[PDB]
Amino acid sequence: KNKCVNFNFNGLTGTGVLTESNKKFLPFQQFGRDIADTTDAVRDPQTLE
C-alpha cells in the first residue's frame, strides 16, 4: 500500500498507488470505475476490502 506497483487483481493488469478506500460496494461488486469508464477502485479477493 501507498507504493507505486504493477498490480494484477483477478486478471486486471494495471499500474498504480494502492490506498485503503472509503468507498462501500454492495456485496456482488468486485471492481469500480470513474466517469471516463476507467478503473478507480478494486476489491481484494482474499481479505474483502
Binding site: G16, D34, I35, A36, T38, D40
Partner: peptide
C-alpha cells in the same frame, strides 16, 4: 461558473497570472 483524465498522459497547466493577480489588475 462551475469547473480520471490524468493517467492517459493528458494534463492541465496553470495560468501564469493567478486569480489574485487578475483581481489586482482589475
Amino acid at each position: 461558473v462551475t469547473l480520471a483524465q490524468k493517467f492517459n498522459g493528458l494534463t492541465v497547466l496553470p495560468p501564469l497570472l493567478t486569480d489574485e493577480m487578475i483581481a489586482q489588475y482589475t
